Design a protein around this motif. Sequence first.
Motif, PDB file in Angstrom:
ATOM      1  N   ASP C  59       1.099  -1.187  -0.062  1.00 33.05           N
ATOM      2  CA  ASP C  59      -0.171  -0.033  -0.045  1.00 33.05           C
ATOM      3  C   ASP C  59       0.791   0.971   0.139  1.00 33.05           C
ATOM      4  OD1 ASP C  59      -1.607   2.339   0.482  1.00 33.05           O
ATOM      5  OD2 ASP C  59      -2.689   1.233   2.044  1.00 33.05           O
ATOM      6  N   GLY C  61       0.050   4.089  -0.315  1.00 34.29           N
ATOM      7  CA  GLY C  61      -0.622   5.204   0.470  1.00 34.29           C
ATOM      8  C   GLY C  61      -1.092   5.915  -0.871  1.00 34.29           C
ATOM      9  N   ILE C  82      -4.808 -10.733   4.390  1.00 34.51           N
ATOM     10  CA  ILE C  82      -3.723 -10.186   3.699  1.00 34.51           C
ATOM     11  C   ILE C  82      -3.095  -9.062   4.487  1.00 34.51           C
ATOM     12  CG2 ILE C  82      -3.219  -8.380   1.653  1.00 34.51           C
ATOM     13  CD1 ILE C  82      -5.738  -9.660   0.157  1.00 34.51           C
ATOM     14  N   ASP C  83      -1.482  -9.157   4.218  1.00 30.81           N
ATOM     15  CA  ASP C  83      -0.778  -8.289   4.756  1.00 30.81           C
ATOM     16  C   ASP C  83      -0.490  -6.937   4.052  1.00 30.81           C
ATOM     17  OD1 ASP C  83       1.260  -9.978   7.371  1.00 30.81           O
ATOM     18  OD2 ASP C  83      -0.470 -10.995   5.966  1.00 30.81           O
ATOM     19  N   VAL C  84      -1.392  -5.810   4.673  1.00 36.45           N
ATOM     20  CA  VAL C  84      -1.061  -4.683   3.664  1.00 36.45           C
ATOM     21  C   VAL C  84      -0.031  -3.665   4.290  1.00 36.45           C
ATOM     22  CG1 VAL C  84      -2.285  -2.630   2.821  1.00 36.45           C
ATOM     23  CG2 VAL C  84      -3.577  -4.791   3.065  1.00 36.45           C
ATOM     24  N   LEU C  85       1.157  -3.563   3.618  1.00 42.44           N
ATOM     25  CA  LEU C  85       2.217  -2.845   4.164  1.00 42.44           C
ATOM     26  C   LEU C  85       2.246  -1.437   3.798  1.00 42.44           C
ATOM     27  CD1 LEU C  85       4.742  -5.895   3.304  1.00 42.44           C
ATOM     28  CD2 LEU C  85       3.239  -5.594   5.265  1.00 42.44           C
ATOM     29  N   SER C  86       2.953  -0.439   4.694  1.00 44.05           N
ATOM     30  CA  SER C  86       2.836   0.726   4.331  1.00 44.05           C
ATOM     31  C   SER C  86       4.311   1.470   4.200  1.00 44.05           C
ATOM     32  CB  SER C  86       1.750   1.340   4.978  1.00 44.05           C
ATOM     33  OG  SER C  86       0.729   1.369   4.856  1.00 44.05           O
ATOM     34  N   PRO C  87       4.317   2.508   3.781  1.00 40.60           N
ATOM     35  CA  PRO C  87       5.642   3.418   3.632  1.00 40.60           C
ATOM     36  C   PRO C  87       6.120   3.913   5.031  1.00 40.60           C
ATOM     37  CG  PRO C  87       4.291   4.003   1.714  1.00 40.60           C
ATOM     38  CD  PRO C  87       3.426   3.237   2.687  1.00 40.60           C
TER      39      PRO C  87
END
Lengths: 223, 223, 222, 222
Positions: C59, C61, C82-87
Amino acid sequence: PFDLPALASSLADKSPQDILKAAFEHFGDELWISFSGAEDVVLVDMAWKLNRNVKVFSLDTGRLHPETYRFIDQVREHYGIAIDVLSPDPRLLEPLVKEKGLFSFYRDGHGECCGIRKIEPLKRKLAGVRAWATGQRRDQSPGTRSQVAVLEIDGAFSTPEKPLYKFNPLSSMTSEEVWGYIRMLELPYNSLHERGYISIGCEPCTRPVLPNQHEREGRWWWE
Amino acid sequence: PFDLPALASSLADKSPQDILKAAFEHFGDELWISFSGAEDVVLVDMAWKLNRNVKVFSLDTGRLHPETYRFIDQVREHYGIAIDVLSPDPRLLEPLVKEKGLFSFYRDGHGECCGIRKIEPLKRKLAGVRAWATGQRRDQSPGTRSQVAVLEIDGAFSTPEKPLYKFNPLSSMTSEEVWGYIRMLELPYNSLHERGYISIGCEPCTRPVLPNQHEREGRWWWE
Amino acid sequence: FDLPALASSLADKSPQDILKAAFEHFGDELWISFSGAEDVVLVDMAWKLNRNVKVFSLDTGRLHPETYRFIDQVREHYGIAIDVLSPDPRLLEPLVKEKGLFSFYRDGHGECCGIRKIEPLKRKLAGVRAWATGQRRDQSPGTRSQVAVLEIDGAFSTPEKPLYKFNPLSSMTSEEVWGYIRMLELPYNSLHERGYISIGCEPCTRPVLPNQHEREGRWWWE
Amino acid sequence: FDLPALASSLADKSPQDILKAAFEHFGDELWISFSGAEDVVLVDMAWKLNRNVKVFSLDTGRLHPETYRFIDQVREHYGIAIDVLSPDPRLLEPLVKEKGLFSFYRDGHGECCGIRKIEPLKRKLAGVRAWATGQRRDQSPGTRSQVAVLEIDGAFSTPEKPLYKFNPLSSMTSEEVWGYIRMLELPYNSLHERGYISIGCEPCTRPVLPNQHEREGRWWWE
Ligand SMILES: Nc1ncnc2c1ncn2[C@@H]1O[C@H](COP(=O)(O)OS(=O)(=O)O)[C@@H](O)[C@H]1O
Ligand SMILES: Nc1ncnc2c1ncn2[C@@H]1O[C@H](COP(=O)(O)OS(=O)(=O)O)[C@@H](O)[C@H]1O
Ligand code: SF4
Ligand code: SF4
Ligand code: SF4
Ligand code: SF4
């Protein structure tokens, strides 16, 4: 001057532009170009390049996409062509809407509505006509094969008495080729093409298709 | 039976529903309701609640938002009203588009196009008509004050010979009240109302308006 | 296991077979990367071979709301957490401070993607033995490099500590991908019904005209 | 300075006079909170009183693309290096992992907002003497609590270490806000031309019908 249908055999593989020249030769400024505000803008481009006074009409069913209205007017103010925008006959349309609504085609098939907003007014136009051309293409058809010929007797509005000849210049042209053309020479095109629309019809009977989905499935899909 | 224009002084303050009863009393099933596919849907609801046989028509300029066509048809199937959808006269329209395009109103003002697609067919309707009602509202006007009376002689289509009476039930009803009404009884409304549209005309001459911006500024804004 | 052996045997096999190979060798440690586009086919196939298939999405963003909706729909549909990863704000913030929010328009997606996708990817892949992606040869106009159904991830693994990468859909074509989607009535991004074939972030993606190559819809200004 | 004294004197003054007051006491240490909506008025006013005006925005990572464009347009327009802040993946990732991307629909915007807005807001304000928002009494249907043009930020300041909050537009009304916008031809979010009055994150905002109150377009399901 007189000719034979063998011409239709002669122009079979000839390029669209040449097929147009042929028509423009035999029928001169009397040849009418059918413009639907879609990718058939290519036919208008070629025709107009060969003849700056080419005659063209668009069948405004009263239910076209606002995008299509803007485009038709665009091709107009772009090539300097007073297009003939044909509308439906109220005395035919009004009764239909009155008892069936503004979306009868969803339950009765598109046949009826088309006939009144599209077919009838077309018939009225082709009357005082000798021959006309449409940008119909072989590949834009489901796949039942190639049924369209570059030149034939209009088997719908023609009569042994008063015959009507029809040309289909873009018959042997492919969708990809059509778009290469329009993109190459930077022709104006319907905004709907940037939204998933390959085949463009009236707003209520046309929808965009998925990636790789055939263009025809975007028309009268409920049928 | 006969009546005097003092009746128009009587109904002045009465509720719209009363003004409709009054109207239905004198002109019965002959009173036509003008439906524009907009917030005037309230008029349709009121008239229909009184008279389940109410007659209503809509002027289809052939340039309405697809959102509008879907709505008009919804009101039709929602109330059970075989609405009269009126279309323009080709013999009048076609020539206008031929020499001016499909967006002439942008430079020549809206008068001419409205005249052919909207006004003319309106006249042809109000011919065999004694009286009719529209949802025109006072506040729906810029602010040149209240110019609409609940009842008056149609100053546009009436003639000494064949007079035409026109009612304006929603005359004194405010926008807030029109929507409080529609939202309350959970009536159906044009989808455009959820996209920023307050006042709804044809697609090319109507644009949504900003927060607090007056509802008339979304119509023929270039004029 | 045997990288060269497997990279060869698998080469011409079906995506399903490649996935069976991957799961067989890495099991519940094979991570499937899902970008919320046509690669849903990859998720579907993997999910059918292993209900517990670990999946993750980057993600940035800056994804299309349609993509946020689609990803979640897949999550709920297959019942995959689901593993939604971010900055990392410590990296993204200073970039936005100086260059703003659309720097990639004038500098090229390099920098932004570097911070919003790559870096967070690296962190995730760093603690992984093997992963998979829906990359297909088909997606680029077949340039100097083609997709290997199996390979050593040169980008995120040290010579000493290797990471394996599977591209099951490597040889599957766009038409085949969609036929699969449509035939099995899989769920798909809404953008696909608006002219979008390839699907990146909202500001760097655009629908393509008929017959225009799908890659022509990403970072078109570059 | 004198909080109580100032809170009183300012009460009925213009938004500009309130900003003049805030700047005079905090100068280049007064942060202006910008959410990408009508509060642009606050930015324009503060910018004209101080060009160097510090400004920050909370990028929940779920904002409208139009909001992303607008925020940057404002940046570019006034020539302000706006501080766009993002969520902490160490907090967000686990929420999205367990609950998904639209947990707020069924749990209430509390938890999500807490992580994507509040948490990063707190950090920012943690090392700030004072800030200002575009909050207006007009924005809520005049409930139990109204907006003080100046107040102690009880939410983000310890009794010993206070934080001051200014709401210059406290008394300014929507109609006036837009007149200002339209009169001075200020730039505004595009979602304003699509039926949006109030503007939050894409999944929790929606346009309102004519005459419908603006607050009814935020977390409408709650
Ligand atoms: N409404 C129309 N107005 C003008 N030309 C049209 C119209 N509809 C079709 N044509 C002609 O027929 C071709 C497009 O046909 P279609 O739109 O594909 O026929 S349809 O029945 O499926 O709608 C074009 O090359 C065009 O010249
Ligand atoms: N084209 C139309 N067809 C049917 N009714 C209409 C039409 N236009 C206006 N009306 C009637 O007049 C009111 C709306 O008028 P307007 O659309 O506001 O007039 S206009 O001059 O701006 O076009 C409604 O209450 C409706 O009953
Ligand atoms: S395409 Fe649909 S809307 Fe158009 S003429 Fe045919 S039936 Fe009517
Ligand atoms: S509103 Fe515009 S499109 Fe409609 S009738 Fe009037 S001029 Fe023509
Ligand atoms: S695709 Fe565009 S917005 Fe998304 S990470 Fe890359 S550069 Fe940034
Ligand atoms: S407004 Fe909705 S999406 Fe945005 S932070 Fe709050 S709960 Fe999350």
